[PDB]
Every structure is written in C-alpha cells, then in structure tokens.
C-alpha cells in the first residue's frame, strides 16, 4: 500500500480562544492543533474547502503534508470535530509523523456482496482497529458476502489484511451478522 | 452514453472489420425485432449483422480503408461484415430486402473500393 501525501497550506494562529475560533470559522478557516512526539503544540488554521475536499477524497484517515511557513511536515488526521447538526468541521487534530512509523488507525469496513434472498445482513461493527504504517493505511476494508445463509457470524478475524497491516481489536468482534430476514409477522411484534 | 464505452465500441467494431473481408451498409428504419432476429438467424450463419451509431462508426471506420464509407452513414446504419466467403452477405441482404422491402442498401465496400447499389448488386450477382 503506497498512497501519496496530500499537500495543504497551514498558517499559524495569531490568537487562540472561542472568539478567535468563531472568527476564523466565519471566514472559511478551520482551526487545527498539531501535536506529536515532537512535544510542540502548533495552533494552525487551514482552508476549510480544500481540507474538506481532501478528506472526502481520501477518507478520515489521510496522511498530510502541511506547509508551516515553507516547512513541509508529515501529519495525520487523528480526530475531527463535526457539528452534530449542520455537519461542518469545527476543529482538527493532527499528529506529526516520520516515515516508517507504526500507526493505530480506525478504518471503516464496507460490506459488499449478494446475500441469499431469505437473508438479512446487519453490519454491526462500524469501524475496526489496525496497526499499520503511516504511508500504507487503507481507506476501506472490504467484506464480501455470498452464499451466507442462516446465522453466519463474521468476526473481526475473517477480514483480510494486506501487508504491513495488523489487527489490534480482539478478533471476536461481529463485524457482520447474517440473520434470517424478519417476517411480515416479526416486524409487527417488536416494540409492542 | 459515456465516452469510454463509445471508445471501446469503436475499437471492437474496428477489430471486427479487420477480421471481415468485406462490408455492406444498409438502412433498417421500418423493421421489427422479430424479422430482425430471423435475419440474425439467417446472417449469423456465416457473416455478422449489426448496427452502430454513425459518430461511433466514423471513428471505427477511420481505421481501415472504409474511410470511403463516411458518405454512406446517412440514415440508420446496419453493417454486414461478411467473414465466411465474400458474396453470402450481399445475396442474403438482397433477398431480405426483396421479401421485406423495408430495407435500403446504402452500399458496400471491399478491395479498396466503396461501391454503390448497382456495383454491389453486380458483385452480389458476381
């Protein structure tokens, strides 16, 4: 797995606080904090539009090259602050990284396939935990479902992991549960 | 329809022509899929009978010497690629036009020449 770093421009914040953050969000700037093993907290501001586009293109766990006043720095999107209601981006958490670093990452698992018609499949574990390399973090992990019948329990173990990818979660996690499709009678019974 | 699918169709139709010895261009406006499928029974034996969009064909026809068939793309384009022998497609289309009377042959091509209805009928007879 070899993904390209993404190039973003950051400018160091002049003021910090709720008023400064509201003002910065007002004119299209998103506040971010760069903290890592370098033990240097940088309060930065990013273009909201371009950052959002990069996130959409390359998921939540994207590797970034930030332009701190000419300096190109490798960072990772550790956390995002989204408004519960209007789905903005409120704040960003960025972790300094050097190449060849072991990274702990939540990666979304997507269920694809054609289950048997008398089957309903429920995706129970929304996202799974991976130890990998900073330059080689998947975007999605795929689970195929074909011929799955009766109660077919897919645990965290059965997900295929590429090279350099390590499963941190306990492999018991029911990522996908295959069940009998609820009946025309069963639906009228739950909740009463 | 997307441009990639059109490019793939252009390449495939070009490839099918390079495997064809000669071609016939006809008009099908005015026939149903029933008799059309019966024709694919008749023409599917040796030759190949298909239809393509003219703007797709001219990029497919610019490949070989069927660049002289650009002027026969007027009207709905039905192409008969004669692969087995030469004359089978011409006589089969002539009889299908005699029975149906709903087909008009725009022309044909082979041996470096694109040739009109009279010359096709000659080769269809010769």
């Amino acid at each position: 797995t070899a993904n390209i770093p993404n190039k973003l421009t950051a400018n160091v914040r002049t003021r910090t606080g709720k008023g400064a953050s509201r003002q910065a969000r007002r004119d299209g700037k998103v506040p971010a904090v760069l903290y890592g093993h370098g033990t240097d907290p940088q309060h930065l501001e990013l273009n909201a539009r371009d950052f959002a586009a990069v996130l959409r293109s390359h998921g939540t766990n994207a590797i970034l090259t930030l332009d701190i006043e000419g300096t190109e720095q490798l960072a990772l999107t550790k956390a995002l602050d989204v408004h519960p209601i209007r789905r903005n981006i409120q704040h960003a958490d960025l972790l300094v990284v050097q190449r060849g670093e072991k990274v702990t990452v939540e990666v979304t698992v997507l269920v694809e396939g054609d289950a048997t018609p008398g089957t309903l499949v429920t995706q129970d574990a929304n996202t799974i935990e991976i130890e990998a390399e900073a330059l080689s973090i998947p975007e999605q992990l795929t689970v195929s479902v074909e011929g799955v019948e009766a109660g077919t329990q897919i645990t965290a173990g059965q997900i295929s992991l590429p090279e350099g990818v390590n499963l941190i979660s306990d492999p018991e996690l029911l990522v996908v549960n295959v069940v009998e499709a609820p009946s025309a009678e069963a639906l009228e019974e739950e909740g009463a | 329809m997307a441009k990639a699918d059109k490019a793939t169709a252009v390449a495939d139709i070009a490839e099918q022509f390079k495997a064809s010895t000669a071609t016939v261009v006809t008009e099908y406006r005015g026939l149903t899929v029933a008799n059309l499928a019966e024709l694919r029974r008749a023409l599917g034996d040796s030759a190949t009978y298909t239809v393509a969009k003219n703007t797709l064909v001219k990029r497919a026809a610019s490949e070989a010497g069927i660049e002289g068939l650009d002027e026969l793309f007027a009207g709905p384009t039905a192409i008969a690629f004669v692969k087995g022998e030469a004359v089978d497609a011409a006589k089969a289309i002539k009889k299908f036009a005699k029975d149906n009377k709903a087909l008009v042959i725009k022309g044909g091509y082979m041996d470096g020449k694109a040739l009109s209805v009279a010359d096709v009928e000659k080769i269809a007879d010769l």
Binding site: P84, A181, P182, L187, E188, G191, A192 | -
Partner: protein
C-alpha cells in the same frame, strides 16, 4: 405502547428543553436513520404510530431500531377542578428529544423504499426531521 416497568419516582418535573443532543447523535445500528431538528416531548402513541407506518410500508423484510424510550412521565389533573390541592396523576409517558438525536433506524435493501418509509414515519412526528445515512 412502551411503558417502563417501574420508576423510582412516579411524579417528576418537566424535562427541560435547553440544548442540543450530545449522545445518540449518530447512526449506529441500521443503514439509515431519522435525525430530529426540533425540541419536543414524544409520547408512546406517536412512536407506535410511526413504527406501524414504517412496518406497513417496508412490509416484508428489513429491521427497525428505536433509539429512545418514553420513560419520563407526564401527569394531568382531572378536569373541572380549580388550581391547587396537590399535583395531578400521571397519564402519558414521553421522552425528551433534542435536536441532533437519532430516533428511528432502518436496515433495508432498497434505498427509495427506505426513504419513503422514513418519510411516512416523519409525517407522524410533531417536529421537523430528516433522513441520515451512515455515509459522512
């Protein structure tokens, strides 16, 4: 009609309506969900009406999740009585819903039918609400 089996205090103050939802703000079980936009109290009957509306629509298959339980009560005193003389007696069992909360959750193959079912559900609710999927 979902009624809690027992409560520690059967007569309570009104659930106060300030702020936006902190928990339950994401779709967690089904493919789709309904996100609330207003502040409200939601009773038993509204929930069962919406749930039957969904069930009638999707009909055959797919499963539904209800993320909120009407466990906070509301009392009414008998009519034709003056003010005072003690608090009333409980009648109707509600839940305090704030904007951002996810009410109903659906797992169903088809997208359009799912949206239609959730729309039928929303029309039964006293508040503005919208359909939210698990995609960001």
């Amino acid at each position: 009609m979902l009624i809690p089996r027992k409560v520690k205090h059967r007569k309570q103050h009104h659930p106060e309506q300030r702020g936006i939802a902190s928990g339950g703000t994401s779709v967690s079980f089904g493919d789709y969900g309904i996100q609330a936009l207003e502040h409200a109290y939601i009773t038993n009957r509204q929930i069962e009406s919406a749930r039957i509306a969904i069930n009638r629509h999707i009909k055959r298959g797919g499963k539904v999740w209800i993320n909120i339980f009407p466990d906070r009560p509301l009392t009414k005193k008998p009519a034709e009585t003056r003010m005072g003389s003690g608090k009333g007696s409980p009648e109707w069992w509600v839940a305090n819903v704030k904007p951002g909360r996810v009410l109903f959750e659906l797992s169903y193959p088809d997208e359009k039918t799912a949206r239609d079912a959730l729309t039928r559900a929303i029309h039964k609710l006293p508040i503005k609400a919208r359909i939210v999927t698990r995609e960001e």
